[PDB]
Design a protein around this nucleic acid. Structure first.
Lengths: 93, 227, 60, 129, 173, 143
RNA sequence: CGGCUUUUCCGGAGUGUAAAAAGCUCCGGGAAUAAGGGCUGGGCAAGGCCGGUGGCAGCCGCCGCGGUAAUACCGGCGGCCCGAGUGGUGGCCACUAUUAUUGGGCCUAAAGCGGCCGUAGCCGGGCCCGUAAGUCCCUGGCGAAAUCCCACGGCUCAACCGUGGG
């Protein structure tokens, strides 16, 4: 289960910032791909234009914070976003 | 408490009054202990006080401070003698100090406690610190200075719950005096226990010497003896 | 807890209070014979004069 | 040789009351002595005090109520502001708010308690408790 | 600059009265080290120092700090809601000790012993407002005690953990 | 008479007097001129590495009677030679001729000779880098 | 004797890099599985019996112990203080009012020079008037950051960091 607090649009970059919380009481930490496929469903985003950087689960906490970015075109990430979070997300080999 | 009343009645039965002060404390027109102090009679019979203040006989209300072992000596030997310094007192502002000579430990103990009973005095208490101001007689009402031999002692009021920061001799003497917090400064040789104890005693007695207007009696909750 | 507020006596000659083990004295007035005159040890030793509160009689 | 009337006067008072006399005469009378004598009498330490025109320097007559324990003139005129005043109360008085001190502020010689609300510093002059 | 110790050692390691007054509380409250007791003593002493400093201060900052001090003391559950600056001087160590997490979780009947409660806490089995803390030395506020429950992920959130019935019977007993 | 000067404009003399008489102190004199740090054979070093030259024993001060074992150490650092007390039971046998040794002050009054043995200033800690206390206890072995 | 979870412990999953490692965070297998140091006659007093050496051997910060019973040396047991700490040593502050402004003494304990005069310096009679330099109250500019005190908030908390007041 993932529930959102922050949905903020940066129009100078034309990009959407999503701060969300994952409820994982008693089960191992969810992976990048699972939440990546989870948010895109009810936020209705293009998977390739959407990237996640960090998902921090605190000590002794079942609710973990996470931040994702949602771009519009295939060149915005190649220009602005750094090269790591394409590789970590598999967008670049 | 009731046990103390029982002991008071027992001694009232047994004791027969010798000194002039004996009658009106046996006859019963004196019940306040401070009746003895205010007028300024003399006390010589140990039975006078335990009738009004039987609590002295408690083991927690009597303390043996030191056991000195002095030596006279002659051509045909060194003849020893015991000098025991011990204190007695209720924890509501009436304490006495005593020194007893003897040839055995118990003899000196008994004589010391008996003489300490005669050294009973009345202790003003209050709250004169710059931080407490609680108007409860938990400490000295004002800073005081006592002198005996070389030793000088300054007792300064202190805040509640600080404890007695003073040498163990003054610690015991004040603990039996119903005082809980005080700053202490000691000038001179404090290794000699006897002079230190006597100086603490004299300082406590000197507390009553300071002239006080009623305004500070309210301001510090000054109690003359029992609170 | 009853606070038994006693009246500590005060000397007449000087006005100083009487500490417990002072060798002070208390005696009836020398001329009106009803007023109680206290005399503290310090007042006693040098024998400074005292005055009655009632009749204003002077007496060492 | 004489150097300071005030400290001599305060020592005179204290020493005279240790034995416990009744009427005390101070020889070197000056205006500041009178301004001082106002203050504690306003606190009821002394009885009547008055000035006698001797013809050389005047005398001061005081009746003693047997109230003061120790009354002495702090010599070196320490200038003290307001907010730090407590630092000196620990040096001359036996307890919290016991006794008084005398300060010569811009508005004259006067008790220390009355200066706290008047909000005036000045130089310490004497003390009594 | 070098980070300093937060606790004060006793001035003498071998005073009988202080040693036994320590020992009674150690056995009663069952702390690992005298270091913990000394830390809580220092924690008290900080409040005492602030109180005695502020009581003699005249000024706006003095009053403001005084109100903040009273407010946070009350928030901890140390003082009544109408406490003043005069009663703090009468506080005792045990007032701090009863507010320890281990003590409080035991007084909820959630353990048969001090050490059992400590074991449950340090093994991440007790939750506060849905958050897990592994420090029995923690001091609880007055607005969180009602949230002291068993950790959901723990087997003991399950009402039939074999120790649980014995725990609840001891609560009954 | 009265301790002097007490004047409000007497700072110079009130300071000069105190500075002068602070020289009557001995510890302050010992520090500020650092002559502890000029007379020292150890040059302010709580440890030093030396070579042993010969084993000697000394008679305890009266009424204490016995034989206190020790050695003579020349110091590799600078070259001065000092006595070195050896503690432990039968430890003199463990310390041999021409030994690299580690020596340190003996912690007597003011750093003086400890207790009932006079003169000595230092005791041995490590012999050939091996702590002597264990070798007294026999837990380790000299190389 | 019976039962309970696994601090660490092996695997998986996040972060991690812009390379991981960090093993930081979550799940699973999972064993009761890491504790020493010093002291034990007194100043410290917290803590006693026995074997061994017998003024030798040794211990000892000071006082003391051993010339054959050692409660004080060494070994064992017992006990005591602290705790992943614990001991020795050296330097600094306090203890100390043994540096005395706060606050010391100088007849007999170290300490008034044999005496007097006198410059600088220091300390100086009472009253009035003026000045207002010191002195005091108010106010403008100014003493960086960092550290320090307190409330709140964030990381379990803490430390640490920020917001705010000093």
């Amino acid at each position: 289960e993932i529930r959102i607090k922050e949905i903020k649009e940066n129009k100078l970059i034309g990009r959407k910032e999503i701060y969300f919380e994952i409820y994982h009481p008693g089960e191992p930490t969810p992976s990048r791909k699972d939440v990546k496929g989870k948010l895109v469903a009810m936020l209705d985003l293009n998977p390739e234009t959407t990237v996640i950087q960090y998902i921090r689960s605190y000590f002794g906490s079942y609710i973990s914070k996470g931040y994702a970015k949602a771009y519009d075109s295939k060149e915005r990430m190649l220009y602005i976003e750094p090269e790591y979070i394409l590789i970590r997300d598999g967008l670049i080999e | 408490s009731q046990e103390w009343k029982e002991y008071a009645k027992r001694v009232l039965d047994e004791w027969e009054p010798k000194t002039k002060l004996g009658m009106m404390v046996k006859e019963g027109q004196i019940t306040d202990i401070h009746e003895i102090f205010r007028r300024g009679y003399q006390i010589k019979e140990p039975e006078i006080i335990d009738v009004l203040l039987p609590e002295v006989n408690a083991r927690e209300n009597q303390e043996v401070l030191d056991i000195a072992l002095t030596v006279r000596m002659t051509d045909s030997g060194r003849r020893v003698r015991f000098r025991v310094l011990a204190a007695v007192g209720n924890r509501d502002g009436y304490v006495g100090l005593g020194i007893g000579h003897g040839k055995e430990v118990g003899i000196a103990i008994r004589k010391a406690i008996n003489y300490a009973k005669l050294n009973i005095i009345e202790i003003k208490r209050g709250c004169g610190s710059w931080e407490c101001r609680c108007r409860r007689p938990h400490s000295v009402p004002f800073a005081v200075e006592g002198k005996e031999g070389s030793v000088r002692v300054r007792l300064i009021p202190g805040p509640r719950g600080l404890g007695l920061v003073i040498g163990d001799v003054g610690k015991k003497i004040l603990r039996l005096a119903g005082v809980q917090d005080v700053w202490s400064q000691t000038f001179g040789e404090t290794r000699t226990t006897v002079n230190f104890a006597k100086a603490v005693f004299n300082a406590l007695y000197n507390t009553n010497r300071v002239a006080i207007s009623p305004e500070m009696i309210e301001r510090y909750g000054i109690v003359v003896g029992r609170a | 807890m009853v606070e038994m507020k006693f009246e500590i006596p005060v000397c007449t000659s000087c006005g100083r209070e009487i500490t417990p083990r002072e060798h002070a004295t208390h005696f009836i007035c020398p001329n009106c014979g009803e007023a109680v005159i206290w005399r503290c040890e310090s007042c006693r030793v040098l024998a400074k004069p005292y005055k009655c509160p009632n009749c204003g009689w002077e007496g060492p | 040789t004489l150097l300071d009337p005030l400290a001599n006067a305060l020592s005179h008072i204290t020493n005279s009351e240790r034995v416990g006399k009744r009427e005390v005469y101070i020889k070197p009378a000056s205006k500041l002595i009178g301004e001082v004598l106002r203050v504690m009498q306003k606190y009821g330490y002394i009885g009547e005090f008055e000035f006698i025109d001797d013809g050389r320097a005047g005398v001061y007559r005081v009746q003693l109520l047997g109230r003061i324990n120790k009354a002495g003139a702090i010599k070196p005129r320490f200038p003290v502001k307001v907010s730090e005043f407590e630092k000196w109360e620990k040096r001359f008085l036996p307890a919290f708010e016991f006794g008084i001190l005398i300060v010569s502020t811009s508005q004259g010689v006067m008790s220390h308690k009355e200066a706290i609300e008047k909000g005036i510093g000045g130089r310490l002059i004497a003390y009594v408790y | 600059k070098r980070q300093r110790k937060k606790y004060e050692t006793p001035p003498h390691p071998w005073i009988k009265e202080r040693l036994d007054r320590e020992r009674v509380l150690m056995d009663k409250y069952e702390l690992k080290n005298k270091k913990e007791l000394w830390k809580h003593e220092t924690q008290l002493k900080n409040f005492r120092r602030r109180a005695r400093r502020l009581l003699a201060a005249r000024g706006k900052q003095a009053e403001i700090e005084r109100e903040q001090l009273l407010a946070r003391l009350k928030r901890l559950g140390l003082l009544p809601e109408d406490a003043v600056l005069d009663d703090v001087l009468s506080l005792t160590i045990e007032d701090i000790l009863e507010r320890r997490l281990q003590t409080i979780v035991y007084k909820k009947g959630l353990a048969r012993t001090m050490r059992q409660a400590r074991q449950l806490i340090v093994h991440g089995h007790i939750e506060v407002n849905g958050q897990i803390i592994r420090s029995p030395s923690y001091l609880v506020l007055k607005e969180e005690e009602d949230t002291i429950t068993y950790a959901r992920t723990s087997p003991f959130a399950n009402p039939q953990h074999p120790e649980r019935m014995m725990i609840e019977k001891a609560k009954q007993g | 008479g009265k301790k002097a000067p007490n004047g409000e404009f007497a700072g110079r003399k009130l300071k000069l007097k105190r500075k002068k008489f602070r020289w009557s102190d001995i510890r302050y004199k010992r520090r500020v001129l650092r002559l502890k740090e000029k007379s020292d054979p150890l040059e302010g070093a709580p440890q030093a590495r030396g070579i042993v030259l010969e084993k000697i024993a000394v008679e305890a001060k009266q009424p204490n009677s016995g034989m206190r074992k020790a050695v003579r150490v020349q110091l590799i650092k600078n070259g001065k030679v000092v006595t070195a007390f050896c503690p432990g039971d039968g430890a003199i046998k463990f310390i041999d001729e021409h030994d690299e040794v580690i020596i340190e002050g003996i912690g007597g009054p003011k750093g003086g000779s400890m207790g009932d043995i006079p003169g000595i200033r230092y005791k041995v800690v490590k012999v050939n880098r091996v702590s002597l206390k264990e070798l007294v206890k026999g837990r380790k072995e000299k190389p």
